[PDB]
Structures are given as C-alpha cells and as structure tokens.
Amino acid sequence: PVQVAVIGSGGAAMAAALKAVEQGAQVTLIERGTIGGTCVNVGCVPSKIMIRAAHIAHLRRESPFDGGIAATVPTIDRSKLLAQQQARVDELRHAKYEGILGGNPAITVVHGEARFKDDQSLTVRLNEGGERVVMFDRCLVATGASPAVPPIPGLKESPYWTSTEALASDTIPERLAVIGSSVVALELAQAFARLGSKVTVLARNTLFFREDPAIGEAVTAAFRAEGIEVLEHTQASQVAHMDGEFVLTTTHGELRADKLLVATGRTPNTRSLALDAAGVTVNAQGAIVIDQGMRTSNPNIYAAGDCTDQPQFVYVAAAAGTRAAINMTGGDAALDLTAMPAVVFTDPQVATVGYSEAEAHHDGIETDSRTLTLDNVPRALANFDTRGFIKLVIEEGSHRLIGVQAVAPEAGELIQTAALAIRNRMTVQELADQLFPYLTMVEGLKLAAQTFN
Amino acid sequence: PVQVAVIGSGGAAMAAALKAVEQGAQVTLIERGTIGGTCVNVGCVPSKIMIRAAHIAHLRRESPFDGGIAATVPTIDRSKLLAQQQARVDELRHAKYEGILGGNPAITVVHGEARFKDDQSLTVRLNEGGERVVMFDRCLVATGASPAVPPIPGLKESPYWTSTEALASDTIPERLAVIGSSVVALELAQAFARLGSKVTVLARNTLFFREDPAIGEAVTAAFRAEGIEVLEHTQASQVAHMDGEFVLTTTHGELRADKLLVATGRTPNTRSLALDAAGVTVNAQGAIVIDQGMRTSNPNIYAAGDCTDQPQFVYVAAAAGTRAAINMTGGDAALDLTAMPAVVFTDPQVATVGYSEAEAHHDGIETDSRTLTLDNVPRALANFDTRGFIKLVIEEGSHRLIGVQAVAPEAGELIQTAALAIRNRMTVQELADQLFPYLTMVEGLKLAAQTFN
Ligand SMILES: Cc1cc2nc3c(=O)[nH]c(=O)nc-3n(C[C@H](O)[C@H](O)[C@H](O)COP(=O)(O)OP(=O)(O)OC[C@H]3O[C@@H](n4cnc5c(N)ncnc54)[C@H](O)[C@@H]3O)c2cc1C
Numbered sequence: 068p069v070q071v072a073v074i075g076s077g078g079a080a081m082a083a084a085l086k087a088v089e090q091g092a093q094v095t096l097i098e099r100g101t102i103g104g105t106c107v108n109v110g111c112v113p114s115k116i117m118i119r120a121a122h123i124a125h126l127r128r129e130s131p132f133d134g135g136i137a138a139t140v141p142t143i144d145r146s147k148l149l150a151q152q153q154a155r156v157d158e159l160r161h162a163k164y165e166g167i168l169g170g171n172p173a174i175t176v177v178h179g180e181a182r183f184k185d186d187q188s189l190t191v192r193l194n195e196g197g198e199r200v201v202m203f204d205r206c207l208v209a210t211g212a213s214p215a216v217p218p219i220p221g222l223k224e225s226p227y228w229t230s231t232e233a234l235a236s237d238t239i240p241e242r243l244a245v246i247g248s249s250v251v252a253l254e255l256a257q258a259f260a261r262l263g264s265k266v267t268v269l270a271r272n273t274l275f276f277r278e279d280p281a282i283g284e285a286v287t288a289a290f291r292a293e294g295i296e297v298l299e300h301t302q303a304s305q306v307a308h309m310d311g312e313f314v315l316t317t318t319h320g321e322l323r324a325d326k327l328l329v330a331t332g333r334t335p336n337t338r339s340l341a342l343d344a345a346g347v348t349v350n351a352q353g354a355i356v357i358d359q360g361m362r363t364s365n366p367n368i369y370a371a372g373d374c375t376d377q378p379q380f381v382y383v384a385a386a387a388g389t390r391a392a393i394n395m396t397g398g399d400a401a402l403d404l405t406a407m408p409a410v411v412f413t414d415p416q417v418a419t420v421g422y423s424e425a426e427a428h429h430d431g432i433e434t435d436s437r438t439l440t441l442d443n444v445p446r447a448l449a450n451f452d453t454r455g456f457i458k459l460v461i462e463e464g465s466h467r468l469i470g471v472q473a474v475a476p477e478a479g480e481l482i483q484t485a486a487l488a489i490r491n492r493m494t495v496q497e498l499a500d501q502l503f504p505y506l507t508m509v510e511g512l513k514l515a516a517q518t519f520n
Numbered sequence: 521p522v523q524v525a526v527i528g529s530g531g532a533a534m535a536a537a538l539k540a541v542e543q544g545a546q547v548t549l550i551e552r553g554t555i556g557g558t559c560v561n562v563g564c565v566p567s568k569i570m571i572r573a574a575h576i577a578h579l580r581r582e583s584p585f586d587g588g589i590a591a592t593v594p595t596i597d598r599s600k601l602l603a604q605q606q607a608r609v610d611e612l613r614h615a616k617y618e619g620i621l622g623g624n625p626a627i628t629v630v631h632g633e634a635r636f637k638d639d640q641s642l643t644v645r646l647n648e649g650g651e652r653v654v655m656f657d658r659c660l661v662a663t664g665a666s667p668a669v670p671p672i673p674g675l676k677e678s679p680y681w682t683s684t685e686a687l688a689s690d691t692i693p694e695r696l697a698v699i700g701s702s703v704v705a706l707e708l709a710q711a712f713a714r715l716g717s718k719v720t721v722l723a724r725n726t727l728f729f730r731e732d733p734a735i736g737e738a739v740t741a742a743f744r745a746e747g748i749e750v751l752e753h754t755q756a757s758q759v760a761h762m763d764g765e766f767v768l769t770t771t772h773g774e775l776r777a778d779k780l781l782v783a784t785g786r787t788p789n790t791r792s793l794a795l796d797a798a799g800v801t802v803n804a805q806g807a808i809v810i811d812q813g814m815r816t817s818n819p820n821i822y823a824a825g826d827c828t829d830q831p832q833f834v835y836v837a838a839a840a841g842t843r844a845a846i847n848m849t850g851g852d853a854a855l856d857l858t859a860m861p862a863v864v865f866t867d868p869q870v871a872t873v874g875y876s877e878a879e880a881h882h883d884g885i886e887t888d889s890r891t892l893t894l895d896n897v898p899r900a901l902a903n904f905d906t907r908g909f910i911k912l913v914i915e916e917g918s919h920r921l922i923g924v925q926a927v928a929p930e931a932g933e934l935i936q937t938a939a940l941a942i943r944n945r946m947t948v949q950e951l952a953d954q955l956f957p958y959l960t961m962v963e964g965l966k967l968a969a970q971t972f973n
C-alpha cells in the first residue's frame with residue numbers, strides 16, 4: 068500500500084489522514100504536541116466559547132432596551148468559565164480527533180517531532196526519547212503556524228500573552244493592552260472587554276487594514292461604543308514590566324495595563340523541518356510554496372494549511388488536506404477558493420466572500436457597488452441596533468454578484484447565502500427576485516441587491 | 521390611463537399601488553383604518569420588537585454560562601417598552617407606507633370602507649361620512665384577514681385578547697393562558713413568558729400540527745425547558761371572567777389566569793365587500809379564490825395577500841400584489857412559491873422551505889432524509905445549547921435537495937442558504953462540497969448534507 072507520511076494533526080493533517088486511508092494507503096501521522104492542533108485546542112473552539120460567554124456578559128450589562136429592562140454589572144468567575152471551556156475543548160478533542168485517529172487502525176500515530184532526513188524519509192525525535200525513521204512514498208507537511216512576536220524593545224523579556232495564554236487565563240485582567248489589529252487580536256480584545264477588562268487596542272494603521280475600509284470603520288465605531296479604546300496609527304516603542312504591571316511607551320504616551328496580548332500575526336512552523344534536505348522551497352515569510360494541488364517543489368511532498376500561504380481558516384486547511392490526500396493517492400484534485408467565506412467573530416460580526424471593490428479594480432475588473440447601512444435593514448431597526456452594513460460588488464457589464472462584505476450581527480450566517488449566489492453565478496437582479504424572510508438579517512442581501520436598479 | 525382600484529394598504533396593496541403607478545396607471549387606494557395594514561401596525565414589526573425585548577430579558581434571567589456569569593431577575597417596565605415599541609412602529613409607518621403613498625401623487629388615497637357596487641365600480645363609505653363611487657377598469661382586493669374566534673361558551677363575553685390587544689398591552693400579566701398553537705400564538709406565548717408571565721398554552725393537538733412533527737417536538741421541549749406549560753391535546757370547554765381573572769374549564773382541569781390570548785388562526789376579511797355583486801367567488805373558509813396570476817372568477821378583479829388562501833407572510837403578500845399589478849396593467853406574471861422560506865420567531869427559531877418528508881410522499885415523490893440534531897453542530901456545542909435540529913429532504917433518485925426544516929437559533933438566517941440551493945436545483949453532494957464558515961449555524965446545512973454519503 069502507498070506509504071503516506073503526515074506531519075501534524077490539525078485540520079489539514081486530519082483531513083489528509085482520513086482521506087489517504089479511505090484510498091487504501093498506509094498512514095503514519097507524526098504529532099509533536101497535543102492531538103488536534105490549533106483550532107480545537109487553542110484556537111477556534113476555545114475563542115468562540117469565550118466570545119459567547121462575553122456575549123452573555125455584555126447583554127447583561129447593557130442593551131438597546133435598557134429603558135424598560137434593568138441591566139446589572141454581572142459578577143464574573145473566570146475560573147469557572149475557564150473550567151467549563153476546557154471541559155468542552157477536551158470533549159471535542161476526544162470525539163473528533165483522538166477518537167477518530169484511534170478509530171482507524173490503518174493510521175499509525177507517532178508522538179514526536181519530525182524533520183526530513185532526506186527526500187524519501189523523516190527522522191522523528193520521539194517525545195519519550197530516542198529516534199525513529201519514517202519512510203514514505205508521499206508526505207504531507209501540515210505543521211501550522213505560531214504567534215508572531217514583533218521586535219519591540221523589552222517585549223521579549225516581559226511575561227506577555229499570545230492568544231494561547233489569553234485563552235487559558237484563569238482571571239480577567241483589570242486592564243488589558245492589545246498589540247495588533249488582526250482577526251485574533253480583535254476577537255479577543257472585545258471578548259475580554261465584555262468580560263470586565265478595560266481594553267486598549269494598538270493598531271499600527273487602521274483595523275482590518277487589508278480589508279475594504281468600511282469594515283474597519285464599522286468595527287472601530289462598535290468597539291468605542293462599548294468602551295474599548297482603539298488607538299489607530301499607534302505603536303509601542305518600548306515595553307517594560309514592573310510592580311505587577313506592563314508599562315508601554317506609545318505614540319499616545321505612556322500606557323499601563325495588568326496584562327499584554329500580542330496578536331500581530333502567525334508565522335508558519337518550518338524551522339524544525341530541515342526542508343532543505345528534501346528540496347522543499349519556502350517564500351520570504353517562511354511559508355511553504357505550493358501549487359493548486361498542494362504540491363511543493365518536491366513533487367512527492369505536499370503542504371497544506373497554516374504552514375503555507377493559504378488563508379488561515381480551519382475549513383481551508385481541511386479542504387487543502389483532503390485534496391492533498393487525493394493527489395498523493397493517484398487522484399487529481401485542486402483547491403478552489405472562489406466562493407470562500409471569511410468570518411470574524413466580533414460583535415457585530417464581519418463576513419466577506421469574493422472580491423472587494425479595490426481587489427476587483429486591482430485585477431482590472433469594472434464594477435459597481437451598493438452599501439446598505441443597517442439603519443435600512445428591518446431586523447436591525449427592530450433590534451434598535453443599526454451599526455454595520457451589507458456591501459455588494461458586481462461586475463459592471465453583466466451585473467453578476469462577485470463580492471459581498473458585511474459587518475452586522477449574524478453576518479457569518481448571511482454571508483453563506485451570498486457565497487452560494489456567487490457560486491451559482493447569479494446577478495443581483497436574480498438574487499433580489501428571490502423571496503427572503505422579512506425581519507431576518509439575510510433579508511439585507513435582497514434589499515441591498517434591489518438598490519442596483 | 522388605466523384606472524386601477526386597490527382595496528387595502530398592507531403589503532399586498534402597497535406593492536400593487538407602486539407597481540401599477542410604475543406602469544403609468546392611475547391608482548385609487550381605499551383604506552378603512554390605519555395606513556400600512558397588519559404587518560407594520562399590529563403584526564410583524566411590533567411582535568418582533570417584543571420578541572427581541574423578551575430575548576434580552578431571558579438572557580438576563582438565565583444562560584448556559586450561569587456557572588461563571590451571575591444572572592438576575594430583570595426588573596421589567598412594560599409601559600416604557602411599549603412606548604419604545606410604538607415609536608418605532610410609527611416611524612416605520614411614516615417612512616415606508618404613508619410617506620410612500622404621499623410620495624406618488626399618481627396614487628389617490630381614500631379613507632373609507634369599500635364594497636363592490638357592481639362589476640365595474642366600488643361604493644366607499646367615507647370615514648368622515650358620506651359616500652363616494654370609484655370606477656375602475658381593474659381592481660385588486662387586498663383586505664387581509666382578522667383574528668379567528670373559536671365558539672367556546674363564555675369566550676365571546678369575556679375581555680380576552682387577540683394578538684392586537686396583547687401587543688398593545690401596557691402591563692405583563694402575572695399569568696397568561698393562550699389558546700392556540702399557531703405561529704402567532706407561540707411567538708407571543710414565549711415573548712410574554714420571558715417578559716415575566718407564567719404562561720400556559722392550550723393546543724388542540726400538538727404544536728405546529730401542520731408541520732413535520734420534529735418541529736413541534738423541539739419547540740415543545742424548548743418551551744418547557746424555560747417554564748412554559750404546554751398542554752397538548754387540550755381544549756377549553758368554558759371561559760368565565762370574575763374578580764379580575766379568567767377561569768377556564770379544560771381537559772387538564774380548572775385553569776386560572778389574569779389575561780387570555782386567543783390565537784387560533786386568521787380569517788379573510790371579505791364580508792364588507794359584497795363580493796357577490798361583482799362575481800368574485802370565495803371558498804369554504806371565505807378566502808377569495810385566485811389563480812397563478814392572482815385573478816379572481818371576475819377577470820377584471822384580482823386578489824392577493826391574507827384575504828386569499830396564500831401563505832400568510834408579508835413578503836408573499838407583497839410579491840402577490842406586485843405581480844397582480846403587472847397583470848392588471850397588461851403584463852403577464854405568476855407567483856412562484858417553490859423556494860418560499862417560512863420563519864417562526866420563537867427561540868430557537870423554526871424555519872422551513874420546500875417539501876417535508878410527508879408532503880413529498882403525499883405527492884408521490886420518493887425521498888431520503890437526514891436529521892442532524894444540534895448536539896452535532898459545532899456552533900451549538902460552543903454555545904452550550906444543543907436543542908434543535910436541521911433536517912434535509914432529497915429526491916431519492918437524483919439526490920436533489922427539495923426541502924429543509926430546522927429548529928435552531930438563527931434558523932431564519934440559515935434557511936435562506938437552503939432556499940437558494942433548492943432554487944439552483946443543487947444536490948446535497950454539491951452543497952456539502954461548498955466551503956462553509958466553521959462555528960456558524962449555517963455550517964449545520966453542510967454537516968447534514970454530508971451524512972447522506
Ligand atoms: C485564537 C485563534 C482563533 C481562531 N478562530 C478561527 C475560527 O473561528 N475559524 C477558522 O476557520 N479558523 C480559526 N483560526 C485558525 C485556525 O485555527 C487554523 O487556521 C487551523 O487550525 C490551521 O490548521 P492546520 O492543520 O493547518 O494547523 P494546526 O492546527 O496549527 O496544527 C499543526 C500541527 O502540527 C504540529 N507540528 C508542527 N511542527 C511539527 C513537527 N515538526 N513534528 C510534528 N508535529 C509538528 C503542531 O504541533 C500542530 O499540532 C483561529 C486561530 C487562532 C490562533
């Protein structure tokens with residue numbers, strides 16, 4: 068049987084292992100740490116749980132209906148919340164990862180750190196000690212990424228937090244400074260603020276600097292409306308820690324906080340791989356270079372997930388691994404990200420799919436667009452919360468919907484309707500023609516579509 | 521210009537008026553009461569607002585995270601809530617109805633009650649007094665419906681509530697009895713319960729008796745989990761009112777409550793129309809009989825909305841009126857309800873589209889189905905609330921998705937993705953192939969689709 072080696076056990080690796088076995092191949096999976104990788108252990112799952120707890124805390128503290136419903140500062144026991152959060156994480160790890168790895172004897176799991184010995188084998192330093200060599204006909208690298216650490220003087224020697232330490236924190240800091248303006252930084256910034264922290268975010272430029280500017284504007288306004296300080300075009304030139312608190316020298320003067328979260332990005336995990344030994348090329352960022360079929364410069368070796376330059380979402384990583392497994396077992400598949408949705412779990416949520424106006428123009432596409440602010444959406448008016456918008460981008464000539472960006476509660480739910488419309492190459496007229504439920508957020512897609520006439 | 525007469529000013533009438541004028545016709549619109557009709561004044565809008573207030577009150581009282589976040593019985597001031605609710609209703613009536621009727625001089629608005637004088641004109645009893653005859657080449661009847669009143673001995677002489685009185689109530693009754701098991705009955709039952717009332721629902725059979733049974737089961741369990749008493753296969757044989765309270769004789773013994781809501785259905789408003797004078801036929805229920813193009817037995821007269829047998833949703837009524845206006849002005853349009861979504865704003869919400877298993881079988885269609893309970897949906901597990909399910913129905917032969925029924929938070933948002941898939945005649949395999957955001961409720965559609973293999 069085809070010997071397939073898989074480094075890692077996150078979404079990308081898991082998808083590949085199961086698919087490879089499904090294709091009759093013998094799989095040897097090597098994991099240096101906890102089975103399940105990032106998403107289930109220190110990523111998606113724990114963060115979303117903390118965000119939901121934050122949502123309840125926020126609504127107990129305030130709402131658009133406080134005129135007739137009394138609100139109260141909720142007493143928070145982070146230690147109990149943490150315990151509940153961890154129990155759920157453990158359950159999911161067992162059920163969908165460990166239990167699945169053990170549910171396929173065809174998959175041999177090796178606990179140790181792997182690195183290429185040469186172009187046809189791996190050397191694994193076993194956790195228990197000693198070494199083992201794994202031969203392979205095909206190998207998939209799915210090592211994921213790790214939190215980036217900016218070279219700010221004094222930061223390296225302070226006890227700062229990365230998303231991992233923040234999610235595992237058993238207490239809510241009185242004051243939390245956050246360096247970064249990325250999805251991770253903002254999701255956690257708002258979660259902690261709602262759980263009781265006085266949060267100050269330091270963004271080098273503006274929030275969601277790589278996205279359509281209307282997004283960063285809506286999120287910024289949202290954050291400030293609930294007491295979160297957002298310092299745009301701000302950086303920390305020095306970090307110090309004394310007497311139980313961090314002291315940051317910033318463009319806005321001295322900022323002090325009990326805890327410091329650093330979330331400026333995630334760099335691929337490729338140093339402990341000796342990629343050079345197997346002829347696998349990496350770009351400037353350290354990301355393993357791959358083609359449409361996840362193939363690396365070494366045709367027998369593939370890469371998928373966060374260790375590549377692919378969008379960092381678990382469903383993109385899983386989709387990449389499944390297809391990688393197909394190509395490693397004779398198949399011929401490719402990853403299509405045309406209708407790929409992206410969601411940011413802040414409140415309101417951010418959701419996108421397809422082209423933004425700027426992206427389309429940069430690629431020489433003539434478009435037209437309509438931005439429907441939520442004060443024009445029945446559901447938003449009925450909830451007395453109109454922050455946000457639903458933006459539609461179409462190809463000027465044919466009026467085909469090619470992109471949608473939204474900042475609104477339930478944005479992550481409605482964005483899937485948009486993704487499907489784009490997948491089915493629908494025109495905004497065709498979409499507006501469909502019957503939508505009145506007083507739902509997704510109805511906003513229809514209303515926005517109708518403003519093109 | 522074509523003289524078009526429109527009776528009513530709700531969703532159906534409004535859509536027709538604007539469309540008729542858009543087609544160069546002279547429009548005379550007759551309304552006996554408040555402009556805007558049911559949805560904006562005493563229906564969708566006020567009910568959804570009350571339900572949102574109920575949502576905040578409920579989450580302040582309890583949540584799956586109460587182990588780490590303190591909850592408190594919120595003090596409710598229904599009078600203030602009512603005032604806020606009414607102000608929003610008034611604003612919407614002005615903006616999207618009155619302001620629109622006055623924004624088209626081509627539309628003449630007559631405040632009075634209309635009835636057919638003959639097959640070519642209407643007699644209108646003006647509110648201010650006196651009479652006026654309106655000649656027409658074409659006429660659209662969009663009179664809507666009214667709350668049904670069951671013939672329960674003693675009910676007629678008691679001061680019971682219909683949805684209108686309940687929505688306009690300035691106080692939260694300590695105990696509220698509800699007769700009915702329909703969308704309206706249940707939406708209000710849960711809203712009042714969450715706002716403080718001890719609610720008891722009397723359902724003749726089971727909840728959502730006309731829908732797939734899994735729906736009534738999930739909703740029933742939800743209601744009981746929060747203290748709402750649901751008496752199945754129960755009826756009131758006698759209603760009395762004394763000493764400030766209602767006394768009901770029921771299959772479960774004597775039930776007492778401070779207020780009584782009767783929501784057993786809505787009957788079309790056709791008695792004050794003298795339909796016989798114009799040759800317009802009505803069925804047993806009193807609903808004006810119409811064809812695919814909204815035409816009545818009298819080709820020059822059309823009907824749309826709640827006064828017909830069409831599904832009672834404002835977007836169905838509006839869609840019916842627009843098309844009616846097209847046919848009254850020379851056009852040739854038809855109303856297609858194939859991918860019509862339906863939403864019930866309880867919590868969790870109920871949402872459906874297309875065929876249910878039973879419906880498909882009754883129509884001689886061979887199907888297969890999969891029911892994914894929410895304890896299998898990542899988002900539900902992360903929120904520690906797994907009540908509900910997502911059910912998919914497919915045509916056995918081709919595996920084309922032909923129906924979806926769901927009971928879950930945000931069901932009304934995810935149902936639109938399903939509706940689009942059905943519209944685009946997608947197979948469950950094709951739907952499961954699409955990339956969905958992880959930890960969103962709509963992801964449940966993909967997960968359910970995947971269980972067909
Ligand atoms: C705080 C946070 C929140 C997030 N929220 C979301 C979200 O809501 N939705 C979403 O879609 N994505 C989210 N993501 C991103 C998502 O977690 C990742 O994109 C995804 O987990 C990456 O999967 P992967 O398989 O590529 O890598 P990973 O899951 O990161 O795992 C790689 C694995 O390989 C192991 N490994 C590395 N090197 C070696 C070696 N030499 N030998 C053996 N094992 C090795 C690692 O230890 C690890 O277990 C979030 C991330 C973070 C950090």
Ligand SMILES: Cc1cc2nc3c(=O)[nH]c(=O)nc-3n(C[C@H](O)[C@H](O)[C@H](O)COP(=O)(O)OP(=O)(O)OC[C@H]3O[C@@H](n4cnc5c(N)ncnc54)[C@H](O)[C@@H]3O)c2cc1C
Nearest residue numbers: 528530531532552557558559563634663664825826833834
């Ligand atoms: C409590 C409640 C909640 C609801 N929630 C939703 C929801 O969330 N979503 C949804 O899609 N639907 C909902 N509906 C239903 C929706 O309100 C109706 O289907 C829709 O309003 C019907 O519109 P229509 O134009 O057919 O009739 P209507 O809006 O009912 O209006 C008919 C109009 O004609 C007038 N009229 C009648 N007879 C005469 C006459 N002889 N002369 C002059 N004028 C006359 C009436 O006074 C009225 O203004 C709800 C209904 C209720 C009662």
